[PDB]
Amino acid sequence: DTLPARVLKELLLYRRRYPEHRQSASEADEIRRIEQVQLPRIAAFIEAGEPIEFVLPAFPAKSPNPGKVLDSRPDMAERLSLSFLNHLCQRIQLFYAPGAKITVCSDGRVFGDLVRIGDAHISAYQDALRLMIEEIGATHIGVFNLEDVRAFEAQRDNHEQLRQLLIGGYAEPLESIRETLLASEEGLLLYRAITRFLYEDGLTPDYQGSKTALQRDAKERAYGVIQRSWAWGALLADQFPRAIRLSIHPQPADSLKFGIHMMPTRDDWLTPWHGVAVNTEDRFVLMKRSEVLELGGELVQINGQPSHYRL
Structure with a gap:
């Protein structure tokens, strides 16, 4: 039983696992080490009679590839995902009265030219996502963008300078991003997945160039994307130290990060904006x-x- 364990059991139903671990890796061993990491973190909020905070880096912008998405705006995929996240908070509130809050920490602004979605597109997606939150009637879902960082206030409307403030304060050098990825099974699994998103983003149905050249480009840019995502994550760990850290990537079971699904899907790496x-x-x-x-x-x-x- 236990209130903290009931919260966790609620999350565990929707956990992203590495596809490579599903067929024969022991999920019970994964759950055991998840319990060790997550339970005292959830319990911290409960002991203080405070609502449980979740941070989720996600919902950056639609893929720029017209062959992968219907349009550049949020659609039924975003809508049902955001509605799911809101209902998750409501289910927690059924047994824990103070309830729960999920802050969507959009990483749309963090990438810049790395994923090749212009800042106008990101701003339009941001605005449309918020509007979508209002019309589903979601009250437990907040949004935190890069420009909401109080410390970066002066640079709030200058997108390249915002990115440089994130990088300057929170990024590790590319050489060190690479060393970290190569240090574990899951680091390499991440690197491969991020490469695939970038490669598939470039594989426009109209693309008639070299596939090999596209793959090599994606491999190089995948280091940068990870660098930004990790910098953003590091920034948010200082903004929201205690919050339960959700993710839209599968995560090691010993990690602070907890991968979570938002709609039924066969692919654990697949997200509604792709x-x-x-x-x-x-x-x-x-x-x-x-x-x-x-x-x-x-x-x-x-x-x-x-x-x-x-x-």
């Missing part, structure tokens, strides 16, 4: 747009805007 919501057998699942078209998915529109597919 895919599409799919209605199939009267349930919503998240899939890659190319995969659903191959299965002969039908486009659904709501109002005048592309929304999701159906099977």
Whole structure:
């Protein structure tokens, strides 16, 4: 039983695991070391009668590849994910009255030219995501962007200088990012996954260039993206030291970071800004747009805007 263990059991239902560990690695051993890390952290809030804080770096912007997403704006995939996160907080509040809060710590601004989404696109996605939070009626979901960093106030509307403030204060050199990735199984698994997102972002259906050159480009840029994500994470550890650290990547079981799913999906690395919501057998699942078209998915529109597919 135990209030802290009940919170954790609620999260464990939606945990992202490394696909490589699902077939034969022992999930019970993973759970044991998760309990050691997460339980006193959750228990800290409960002992103080305070609401449980979660931090989640996520929802940066849609993939720039028109072959992967329906449009540049948040859609049914974001909508159901944000609604899920809100209901997770409500379920916790059922047994723990002070409840829980999830702050979405958007990393859209942290990347810059590394993922190749312009700052105007990021700002539009940011604004549209907040608006989506309001219309689903989510009250336990907050947003924290790079420009909300109180210490960086003067540079709030100068995006490149914001990025340089994050880098200057919180980034490790690329040589050290690389050394860390090469130090563990999971570091290399991360590096491979981030390379794949970048490569697939560049594989536009209209792309007619070299695939090999695209892969080599992605491999180099993946170090930078990790550097920024880790810098952002480090910044947020000082902003919100006690918060339970959620992630949209699978995480080592000994890590402070806890990977969490937001919609049913086969791919543990897949997130709503890199895919599409799919209605199939009267349930919503998240899939890659190319995969659903191959299965002969039908486009659904709501109002005048592309929304999701159906099977």
